[PDB]
Design an enzyme around this catalytic site. Structure first.
Site, mmCIF file in Angstrom:
data_model
loop_
_atom_site.group_PDB
_atom_site.id
_atom_site.type_symbol
_atom_site.label_atom_id
_atom_site.label_comp_id
_atom_site.label_asym_id
_atom_site.label_seq_id
_atom_site.Cartn_x
_atom_site.Cartn_y
_atom_site.Cartn_z
ATOM 1 N N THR A 1 0.727 -1.313 0.000
ATOM 2 C CA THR A 1 0.000 0.000 0.000
ATOM 3 C C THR A 1 0.743 1.342 0.000
ATOM 4 O O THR A 1 1.863 1.480 0.478
ATOM 5 C CB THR A 1 -0.969 -0.052 1.179
ATOM 6 O OG1 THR A 1 -1.733 -1.250 0.997
ATOM 7 C CG2 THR A 1 -1.950 1.117 1.230
ATOM 8 N N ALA B 1 -4.556 -6.901 5.138
ATOM 9 C CA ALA B 1 -5.775 -6.749 4.340
ATOM 10 C C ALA B 1 -7.039 -7.112 5.119
ATOM 11 O O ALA B 1 -7.997 -6.343 5.143
ATOM 12 C CB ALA B 1 -5.681 -7.578 3.068
HETATM 13 C C1 LIG Z 1 0.280 -2.655 0.535
HETATM 14 C C2 LIG Z 1 0.099 -3.662 -0.656
HETATM 15 C C3 LIG Z 1 1.352 -3.196 1.486
HETATM 16 O O1 LIG Z 1 1.522 -4.593 1.221
HETATM 17 C C4 LIG Z 1 -1.092 -2.477 1.398
HETATM 18 O O2 LIG Z 1 -0.782 -2.329 2.783
HETATM 19 C C5 LIG Z 1 -2.161 -3.587 1.282
HETATM 20 C C6 LIG Z 1 -3.478 -2.999 1.778
HETATM 21 C C7 LIG Z 1 -4.632 -3.751 1.440
HETATM 22 C C8 LIG Z 1 -5.848 -3.252 1.919
HETATM 23 C C9 LIG Z 1 -7.056 -3.889 1.663
HETATM 24 C C10 LIG Z 1 -7.068 -5.056 0.910
HETATM 25 C C11 LIG Z 1 -5.871 -5.568 0.417
HETATM 26 C C12 LIG Z 1 -4.661 -4.925 0.676
HETATM 27 N N1 LIG Z 1 -1.804 -4.710 2.159
HETATM 28 C C13 LIG Z 1 -1.575 -5.949 1.707
HETATM 29 O O3 LIG Z 1 -1.616 -6.276 0.524
HETATM 30 C C14 LIG Z 1 -1.233 -6.973 2.785
HETATM 31 C C15 LIG Z 1 0.221 -6.818 3.137
HETATM 32 C C16 LIG Z 1 0.431 -7.424 4.385
HETATM 33 C C17 LIG Z 1 0.568 -8.808 4.489
HETATM 34 C C18 LIG Z 1 0.785 -9.404 5.727
HETATM 35 C C19 LIG Z 1 0.873 -8.624 6.879
HETATM 36 O O4 LIG Z 1 1.098 -9.229 8.090
HETATM 37 C C20 LIG Z 1 0.153 -8.891 9.123
HETATM 38 C C21 LIG Z 1 0.748 -7.238 6.775
HETATM 39 C C22 LIG Z 1 0.527 -6.647 5.538
HETATM 40 N N2 LIG Z 1 -1.460 -8.307 2.221
HETATM 41 C C23 LIG Z 1 -2.244 -9.216 2.816
HETATM 42 O O5 LIG Z 1 -2.843 -9.041 3.877
HETATM 43 C C24 LIG Z 1 -2.345 -10.537 2.061
HETATM 44 C C25 LIG Z 1 -3.359 -10.406 0.922
HETATM 45 N N3 LIG Z 1 -2.771 -11.596 2.975
HETATM 46 C C26 LIG Z 1 -1.889 -12.274 3.722
HETATM 47 O O6 LIG Z 1 -0.675 -12.075 3.715
HETATM 48 C C27 LIG Z 1 -2.517 -13.358 4.607
HETATM 49 N N4 LIG Z 1 -1.799 -13.398 5.874
HETATM 50 C C28 LIG Z 1 -2.067 -12.164 6.646
HETATM 51 C C29 LIG Z 1 -1.435 -12.205 7.990
HETATM 52 O O7 LIG Z 1 -1.989 -13.369 8.640
HETATM 53 C C30 LIG Z 1 -1.719 -14.617 7.969
HETATM 54 C C31 LIG Z 1 -2.275 -14.607 6.593
#
Ligand SMILES: *[C@@](C)(CO)[C@](*)(O)[C@H](Cc1ccccc1)NC(=O)[C@H](Cc1ccc(OC)cc1)NC(=O)[C@H](C)NC(=O)CN1CCOCC1
Ligand SMILES: [Mg+2]
Lengths: 240, 222, 231, 195, 244, 235, 233, 212
Positions: free
Chosen positions: H1, H49
């Site tokens: 993000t 997310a």
């Molecule tokens: C940018 C891309 C930074 O990566 C943004 O913060 C983005 C925001 C966002 C908002 C709404 C919907 C989608 C995306 N965040 C992500 O893409 C996020 C990055 C992230 C991953 C893991 C984290 O650890 C807590 C923190 C940030 N991506 C995700 O959440 C992905 C899609 N899902 C996972 O990694 C699933 N994980 C999450 C943590 O728990 C275990 C499973």
């Protein structure tokens, strides 16, 4: 824990414990609330059978819930402390989460909700207390005056009275108070409040308490001499 | 020390059409370098024209599907046999997944069906409940192989109109059920070639207004 | 008299008056009929309304794909007990991958109602239930009473003037039991049975309520224009 | 959260607190006020773990304000500091302690004396003529040891404070974006707008 | 079940009174009279022991007057056992306040909390109220010398001079007659004893049937001293005022 | 005394039956359902002329598509409304949709019998729950402290309920417009009310699919009162 | 959080035309020590199901008691306990599967790998696997531990897919199982010669065979082998 | 993000990217990072997310319950503090949330509140949150003035996200624009970086580092 359902319905559809709590309010010393154009005044009776009292330290009848809201009452004195304490805590809790002081309607609604809860909770009796909650909402100059009672119902009043001989002073206020034109000034509002108490009290010495609340947390309690001047003025005009 | 998670492999794929939607998944189930089953279905009809698959750790996957199936059942009891819309199902699933935020279901979930306008719908989830509606999604072990192919062939990404100097994009259009199944079969055969955890068999569940139809195809067993 | 204050007290003749007063709430309730063959089981329920402007109180509740009941008495108590049955049926499915037997369903209701009749503070359930179902041993019909007594029957009826329908079924026993592979004729027999409990009023389109379960028939409820066939 | 200072002079207590709020490689804000008014004549500055700081400050504020209403009376700076210390002393043996260090500057109306209390997150209270939390102290204490006098005026105290800020701006590694200065005396609390 | 045997201690009468509170007050009205008088330079606490026996150990005895902390004391009227439960709670509450704020507890705050405990027993819990009325005599730096009373209802009020227990009607009339605002401690001592001497049900008031205490600033420079009178000290003060 | 959850010899719960008597003492509340919307109206009944009648809140919003009017011990309704609002918003959170009016009513009615020796007594208030959903359309429900709820085409509760219900019996038909229904509530309220009906002592509200739940202003209701009087004098 | 102490090795099984076969050796290993030699790891439930268990033996004995108790509980208030409402293999499996997954979810697993073999009331063959993680799967052939690596390849030559099940007789199927047990004895260091075998047929019912031995072993070629490379003598 | 929002003469601009990541895997290019709480309140999201999606949808429910109970739309301060108090309860558990609660009310005027998962809550005029916040700050700060027009402000917000979408490997997809006025929020469309980049490069003459 003690579970007994003390507040319950009767054949005729009444909850006697709530109604008997109203009788305790009727026994209590009179309290009156009159709201003007830019102020609210809370008048209170103090029975004169108690001499050798220490008025410095004796709990005052009108209590500050916050800097902008006040609460007077009629009924059991010990019960009133519990409601006031809860209300004071909720007032600080509201400032903490909403970052804004309570409205008078909100504070009233909370106090009334507590009173209601004790009418259908096991092991407890209702509060033998009716309250008059008055003040000014944050950043607002419209005067607010509310009433609560043991059952839990609450409502807003242009002017209202509770306690012993309240039906006499309510009769007075009903004809003397004009909706179209309320007391324009502080002096006019206080005078009407003292006048209404003089229908019931006995003597205007150390029997009447008056507390004036104005906008932006401007609350002050009148002294004996200040109140006595209103008593002296009213009696001289009466002889006519 | 005891490790509560495992990887059962496999891969899944969801594509949405104009008046239909497909949810495909291979029938292979594995642990480490062993094959557990050559035919173990993981795409399920959950009622109300919703198909679901939770690919990754099969124990968690089965648990989740089982709970959602049960959620659909109690939705009928509590709301006068009302049909659970695909959007409502998706939000319900988010709460199921996020309920175990601090001890997650190790699965990538995909559901498919029809929206309330009768149009094809695919929703997809991360392990902890994040979701998004799309025309297209691949999930599981071979998702990294299949997904970019779908971007190219379903959403026409990086494809421009010939002779327009890369100025006019290839116009988006819905695909026929015949054309979609072709892409699914090619996606899985390609994934089977290059991913060791994918193979044995392919099971597709197609969802139209008429109901839920099934189709099965052989995949390479090596 | 002096022994009806609560359910924890026996009378000198060994009676539980609070349980008997709960039984009285069923007799005040609207009539409902239950009957079965070897292939199907049918519930027929006369719904009651407050007035012409009101709706007709729903009597039949679904518990699972293969089981459900009709109620007579306090409706909220039927909701509590039916919800419990829904959970027990569901527990049997999730844990054992097994459809709950109609006989066990009755045993579970009996034991739940009993605990309320032996403890201080609580009260007996104020409703009677007719449970039908189709399980691994064919079609079934149960009669639940809030005393705890559950009874398996070929046919029965509970509620106000239920004796009329119960006598009819006692005569018709040999006929309707052999209505196998014919839903509509088994319903007709049930609709004719409940008609023996009618006084002044007759069966209308939004008054009648029918439910059926069977061999290749999930538990389904029929209301409104769907029951116009049987009037 | 980083720099919080305090200087008690003849007739007042002066608190200086840095304006920067940083997270990662970004200064998110450069106008942050790191204090709360506990009562009309008592001010508390704070610094420490993100979130904990404000959550603790406001919690204390709420409790003191509740006391003020209940008794219609202002609590003494000594009494407030003792209450704060006890809360931190409870906290340190909790599941998740408040990681917050505070300075409590107040004017005692009964004694007609300014008072400055320094309390760390462990619940370690000390009354001082001048105080500081974090790395600030490693510069300011020795500086104040030299230049401080007990009979100084508020204006002299502000110049003494300017001398501290100048030294910190010269030798501190991080940019703390200057300070908000507040004075606590017999007339209450007021903010110096131009510093 | 058990409902049958419940007295329902926390309910209203049709008139809006609390049965048990009213009956607890009736009990207290038979207890030995206790008087409190507040002067400009101190406070007096006097109390009459309940029909003393000649073989009662008088010097090592405590029935009426109890010490809550260095600055606050109470006179009891009612059930002693009940009062001791409340007193230990009050002693603890005072120490909690000192521990928290490093300041001695203000008199009213201690009185309010003890009164709130009594209130609780009248509104919930299904238990009988405490059959006790206190006269609180104390000092703090906000309001100075203070006299309070609390009763089983949990309602408390402040006083210049007050009596609890038996013959309060007669006692309050006599106090109202001879009390004045510019009074000294030594004068208040005399008033307290004269009032008990006239309101007593006994034939003659003697040293062995009394408990006495003062709270003066009679210590050296700006500090309060609590004096619980010894038997001989009561004997002397009784002769000095001309009662015996 | 006697148990709270005790049955009478006739087969009724004493406390539930006694709470129904409390509801009869309450102020009148009327609801009428049409194909163009559902109308809710109440009698405010100020105990004194000094009481500011606009603070009398006997018509209440639960969600945008569900409204509520009350009658009886109105203090008891606060926790019922709170529960309803939470239930409505919670369902929207779990399922990304509006909640069915029947399902909301059922949720409120589940509280009703959660009393005994849970709360100490039944509620002393009846509720008229009006709303709209996509499945069953415009609906009006009457929720009692017995835990029972009936759907109604029209319903009156409170002190003048039996007199008003008989009037609603004759006047209601399936082709009523919203404007007709508004006047019909005002007409029947004026008939059963003690004091003379005006904009200050009576309040109207409605729920439509398009605009959702709306409490009418005193200016809007006043015109409907004036329109009502003219139409009755016209024949 | 556990560690397995006394352990049981491979459990192997397969489907044939009329039913299922399952087998497991009678060893209770204590690490490398072959401690207990009279351990029965096939446990029949009724006359239509056999549960084969590998892994921790203490947990196996706990599961034995659960199944034993399940039969008792099913008989309660059940006139058709030996007929229509008898315990099915599918019921017994789903129960165990529920337990296994609940225990792993509490981070306190039953350290086992289980195969439930049986025949349903309608004649259908039942064969399904479940382990300490709550992972479940079904296949024409199933095996645990070393069995998965060595037995399955051999059993899949007989029944490679669903359509091969009707073509496989009980004689052919049993021979494949007995052969697999020999191969496991050659190659599994925590296996024994003695084993038990169970056949659940839809016609002939439950046949439980005890005290079997691996036989017809090829060891004669060993005498020719010398040293590791250049050694001749 | 990468997400931003800034106060100016004509209200508040809010701009976000649309990329989701699972490490170096691009999980999505079409994700919605502005939640519409009510017609006057917006919430940007960055971080985990599911955490973001779940708790901001939850926040909207709490704001709805406020206006039902209080017969008045919730303040931006009160709304932001509900969320900050919530995440503070979960402090240490591992929640990841970088939100910016943007909205207008009568008493407050246009207001922005930064709230994050370790309990920080800050009122301010300009904020950029996410993995590419620094890239957005670089363009936004160097071009920001209070007296920007609605047209110029909308573009600057769009151009700032574009800058970050370009340089930050964990940002991209498309730009979602919003404009918050006294009358409420107004959506200003989805802008795919695939077309927007070249459109901006050609028209503006910028991005000379790239092979044109
Ligand atoms: C940018 C891309 C930074 O990566 C943004 O913060 C983005 C925001 C966002 C908002 C709404 C919907 C989608 C995306 N965040 C992500 O893409 C996020 C990055 C992230 C991953 C893991 C984290 O650890 C807590 C923190 C940030 N991506 C995700 O959440 C992905 C899609 N899902 C996972 O990694 C699933 N994980 C999450 C943590 O728990 C275990 C499973
Ligand atoms: Mg291979």
């Amino acid at each position: 824990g003690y579970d007994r359902a003390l507040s319950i319905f009767s054949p005729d559809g009444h909850i006697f414990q709530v109604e008997y709590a109203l009788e305790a309010v009727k026994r209590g010393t009179c309290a009156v609330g009159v709201k003007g154009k830019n102020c609210v005044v809370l008048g209170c009776e103090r029975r004169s059978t108690l001499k050798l009292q220490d008025t410095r330290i004796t709990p005052s009848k009108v209590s500050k819930i916050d800097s902008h809201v006040v609460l007077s009452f009629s009924g059991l004195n010990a019960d009133s402390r519990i409601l006031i304490e809860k209300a004071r805590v909720e007032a600080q809790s509201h400032r903490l989460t909403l970052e804004d002081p309570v409205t008078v309607e909100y504070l009233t609604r909370y106090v009334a909700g507590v009173q209601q809860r004790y009418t259908q909770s096991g092991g407890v009796r209702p509060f033998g207390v009716s309250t008059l909650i008055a003040g000014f909402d944050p950043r607002d100059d419209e005067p607010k005056l509310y009433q609560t009672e043991p059952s839990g119902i609450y409502s807003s009043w242009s002017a209202q009275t509770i306690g012993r001989n309240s039906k006499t002073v309510r009769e007075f206020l009903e004809k003397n108070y004009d909706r179209k034109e309320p007391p324009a000034t502080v002096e006019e509002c206080v005078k009407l409040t003292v006048r209404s108490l003089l229908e019931v009290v006995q003597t205007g010495a150390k029997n009447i308490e008056i507390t004036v609340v104005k906008p932006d947390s401007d609350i002050v309690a009148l002294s004996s001499e200040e109140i006595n001047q209103y008593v002296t003025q009213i009696e001289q005009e009466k002889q006519e | 020390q005891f490790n509560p998670y495992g990887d059962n492999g496999g891969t899944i794929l969801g594509i949405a059409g104009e008046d239909f939607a497909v949810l495909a998944g291979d029938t292979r189930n594995i642990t480490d370098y062993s094959i557990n089953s050559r035919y173990e279905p993981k795409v399920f009809d959950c009622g109300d024209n919703i198909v679901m698959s939770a690919n990754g750790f099969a124990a968690d996957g089965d648990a989740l599907v089982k709970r959602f199936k049960n959620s659909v059942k109690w939705y009928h009891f509590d709301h006068n046999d009302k049909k659970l819309s695909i959007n409502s199902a998706a939000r319900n699933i988010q709460h199921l997944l996020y309920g175990k935020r601090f001890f997650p279901y190790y699965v990538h979930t995909i559901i498919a069906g029809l929206d309330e306008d009768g149009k094809g719908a695919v929703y997809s989830f991360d392990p902890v409940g994040s979701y998004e509606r799309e025309q297209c999604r691949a999930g599981g072990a071979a998702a990294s192989l299949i997904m970019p192919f779908l971007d190219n062939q379903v959403n026409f990404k990086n494809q421009y109109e010939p002779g327009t100097n890369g100025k006019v994009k290839k116009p988006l259009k819905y695909l026929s059920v015949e054309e979609v199944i072709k892409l699914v079969r090619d996606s899985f055969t390609s994934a089977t070639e290059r991913h060791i955890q994918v193979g044995d068999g392919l099971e597709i569940l197609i969802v139209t207004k008429d109901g839920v139809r099934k189709e099965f195809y052989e995949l390479k067993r090596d | 008299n002096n022994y009806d204050g609560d359910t924890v007290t026996f009378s000198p003749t060994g009676r539980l008056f609070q349980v008997e007063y709960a039984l009285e709430a069923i007799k005040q309730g609207s009539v409902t009929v239950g009957l079965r063959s070897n292939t199907h089981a049918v519930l027929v329920a006369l719904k009651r309304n407050a007035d012409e402007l009101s709706s007709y109180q729903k009597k039949i509740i679904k518990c699972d794909e293969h089981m459900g009941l009709s109620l007579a008495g306090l409706a909220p108590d039927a909701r509590v007990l039916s919800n419990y049955l829904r959970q027990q049926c569901n527990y049997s499915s999730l844990v054992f991958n097994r459809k709950l037997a109609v006989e066990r369903a009755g045993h579970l209701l009996c034991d739940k109602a009993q605990k309320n009749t032996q403890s201080y503070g609580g009260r007996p359930y104020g409703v009677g239930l007719l449970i039908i179902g189709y399980d691994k041993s064919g079609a079934h019909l149960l009669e639940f009473q809030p005393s705890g007594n559950v009874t398996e029957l070929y046919g029965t009826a509970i509620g106000a003037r239920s004796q009329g329908a119960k006598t009819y079924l006692e005569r018709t026993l040999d006929t309707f039991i052999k209505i196998d592979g014919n839903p509509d004729e088994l319903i007709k027999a049930g609709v004719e049975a409940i008609s023996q409990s009618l006084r002044d009023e007759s069966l209308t389109v939004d008054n009648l309520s029918i439910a059926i379960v069977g061999k290749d028939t999930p538990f389904t409820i029929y209301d409104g224009e769907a029951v116009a066939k049987y009037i | 959260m980083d720099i919080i200072l305090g200087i008690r002079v003849q007739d007042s207590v002066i608190l200086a607190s840095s304006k920067a709020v940083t997270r990662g490689i970004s200064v998110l804000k450069d106008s942050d006020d790191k204090t709360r008014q506990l009562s009309p004549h008592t001010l508390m500055s704070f610094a420490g773990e993100a979130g904990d700081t404000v959550q603790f400050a406001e919690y204390i504020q709420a409790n003191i304000q509740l006391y003020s209403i209940r008794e219609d009376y202002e609590l003494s700076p000594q009494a407030v500091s003792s209450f704060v210390r006890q809360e931190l002393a409870k906290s340190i043996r909790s599941r998740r302690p408040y990681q917050v260090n505070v300075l409590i500057g107040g004017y005692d109306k009964k004694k007609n004396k300014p008072e400055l209390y320094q309390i760390d997150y462990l619940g370690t209270k000390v009354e001082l003529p001048y105080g500081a939390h974090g790395y600030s102290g490693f510069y300011t204490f020795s500086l104040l040891d030299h230049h401080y006098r007990p009979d100084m005026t508020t204006e002299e105290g502000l110049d003494l404070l300017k001398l501290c800020v100048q030294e910190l701006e010269k030798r501190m590694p991080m940019d703390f974006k200057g300070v908000i200065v507040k004075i606590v005396d017999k007339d209450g609390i007021r903010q110096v707008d131009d510093f | 079940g058990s409902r049958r045997y419940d007295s329902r201690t926390t309910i209203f009468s049709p008139e809006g009174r609390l049965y048990q509170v009213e009956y607890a007050l009736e009990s207290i009205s038979h207890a030995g009279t206790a008087i409190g008088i507040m002067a400009s330079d101190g406070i007096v606490l006097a109390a009459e022991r309940k029909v003393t026996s000649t073989l009662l150990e008088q010097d090592t005895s405590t029935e009426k007057l109890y010490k809550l902390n260095d600055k606050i004391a109470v006179a009891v009227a009612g059930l002693t056992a009940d009062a001791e439960i409340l007193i230990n709670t009050a002693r603890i509450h005072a120490q909690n306040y000192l521990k928290t704020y490093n300041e001695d507890i203000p008199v009213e705050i201690l009185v309010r909390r003890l009164s709130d405990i009594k209130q609780g027993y009248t509104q919930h819990g299904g238990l009988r109220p405490f059959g006790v009325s206190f006269i609180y005599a104390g000092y703090d730096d906000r309001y100075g010398y203070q006299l309070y009373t609390s009763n089983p209802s949990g309602n408390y009020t402040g006083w210049k001079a007050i009596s609890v227990g038996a013959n309060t009607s007669a006692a309050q009339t006599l106090l109202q007659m001879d009390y004045k605002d510019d009074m000294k401690v030594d004068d208040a001592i005399e008033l307290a004893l004269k009032t008990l001497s006239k309101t007593t049900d006994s034939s003659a008031l003697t040293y062995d049937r009394l408990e006495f205490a003062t709270i003066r600033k009679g210590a050296n420079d700006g500090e309060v001293y609590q004096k619980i009178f010894k038997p001989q000290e009561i004997k002397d003060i009784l002769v000095k005022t001309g009662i015996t | 005394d006697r148990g709270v959850s005790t049955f009478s010899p006739e087969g009724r719960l004493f406390q539930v039956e006694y709470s129904l008597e409390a509801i009869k003492l309450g102020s009148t509340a009327i609801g009428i359902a049409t194909k163009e919307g559902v109308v809710l109206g109440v009698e405010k009944r100020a105990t004194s002329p000094l009481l500011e009648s606009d603070s009398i809140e006997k018509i209440v919003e639960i969600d945008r598509h569900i409204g509520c009017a009350m009658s009886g011990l109105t203090a008891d309704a606060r926790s019922m409304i709170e529960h309803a609002r939470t239930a409505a918003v919670t369902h929207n959170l779990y399922y990304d949709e509006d909640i069915n009016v029947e399902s909301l009513t059922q949720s409120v009615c589940d509280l009703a019998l959660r009393f005994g020796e849970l709360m100490s007594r039944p509620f002393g208030v009846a509720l008229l729950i009006a709303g709209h959903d996509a499945d069953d359309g415009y609906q009006l429900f009457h929720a009692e402290p017995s835990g029972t709820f009936y759907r109604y085409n029209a319903k009156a509760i409170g002190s003048g309920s039996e007199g008003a219900q008989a009037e609603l019996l004759n006047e209601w038909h399936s082709s009523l417009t919203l404007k007709e229904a508004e006047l019909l509530v005002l007409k029947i309220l004026k008939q059963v009310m003690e004091e003379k009906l005006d904009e200050n002592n009576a309040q109207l509200s409605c729920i439509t699919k398009q605009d959702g739940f709306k409490i009418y202003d005193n200016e809007k209701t006043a015109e409907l009162i004036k329109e009502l009087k003219e139409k009755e004098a016209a024949e | 959080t556990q560690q397995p102490i006394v352990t049981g090795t491979s459990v192997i099984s397969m489907k044939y035309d009329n039913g299922v076969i399952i087998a497991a050796d009678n060893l209770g290993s204590y690490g490398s020590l072959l401690r207990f030699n009279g351990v029965e790891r096939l446990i029949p439930v009724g006359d239509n199901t056999v549960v084969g268990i590998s892994g921790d033996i203490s947990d196996m004995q706990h599961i034995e008691r659960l199944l034993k108790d399940l039969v008792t509980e099913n008989a309660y208030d059940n006139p058709l306990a030996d007929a229509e409402e008898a315990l099915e293999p599918s019921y017994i499996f789903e129960y165990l599967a529920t337990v296994m997954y609940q225990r792993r979810s509490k981070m306190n697993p039953l350290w086992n790998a289980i195969i439930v073999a049986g025949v349903q009331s309608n004649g259908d063959q039942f064969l399904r696997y479940v382990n300490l993680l709550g992972v479940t799967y079904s296949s024409p052939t199933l095996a645990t531990g070393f069995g998965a690596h060595m037995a399955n390849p051999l059993l899949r030559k007989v029944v490679d897919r669903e359509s091969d099940i009707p073509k496989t007789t009980v004689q052919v199927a049993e021979e494949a199982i007995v052969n697999a047990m020999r191969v496991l004895y050659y190659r599994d260091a925590r296996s024994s010669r003695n084993f038990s075998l169970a056949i659940i047929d839809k016609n002939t019912g439950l046949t439980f065979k005890k005290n079997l031995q691996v036989e017809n072993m090829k060891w004669d070629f060993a005498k020719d082998i010398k040293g590791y490379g250049t050694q001749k003598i | 993000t990468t997400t931003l929002a800034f106060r100016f003469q004509g209200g508040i601009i809010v701009a976000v990217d649309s990329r989701a990541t699972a490490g170096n895997w691009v999980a999505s290019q079409t994700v919605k990072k502005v939640i519409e709480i009510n017609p006057f309140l917006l919430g940007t999201i960055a971080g985990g997310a599911a955490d973001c999606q779940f708790w901001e949808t939850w926040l909207g429910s709490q704001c709805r319950l406020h206006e039902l109970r209080e017969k008045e739309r919730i303040s931006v301060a009160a709304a932001s503090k509900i969320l900050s108090n919530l995440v503070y309860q979960y402090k240490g558990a591992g929640l990841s949330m970088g939100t910016m609660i943007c909205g207008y009310t009568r008493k407050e005027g246009p207001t922005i509140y930064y709230v994050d998962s370790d309990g920080t809550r800050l009122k301010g005029d300009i904020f950029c949150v996410g993995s590419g916040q620094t890239f957005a700050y670089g363009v936004l700060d160097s071009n920001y003035k209070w007296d920007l027009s609605v047209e110029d402000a909308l573009y600057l917000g769009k151009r700032s996200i574009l800058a970050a979408a370009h340089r930050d490997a964990y940002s991209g997809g498309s730009v979602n624009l919003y404009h918050v006025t006294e009358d409420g929020w107004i959506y200003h469309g989805n802008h795919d970086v695939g077309e927007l980049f070249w459109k901006v490069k050609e028209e503006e003459g910028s991005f000379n580092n790239v092979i044109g």
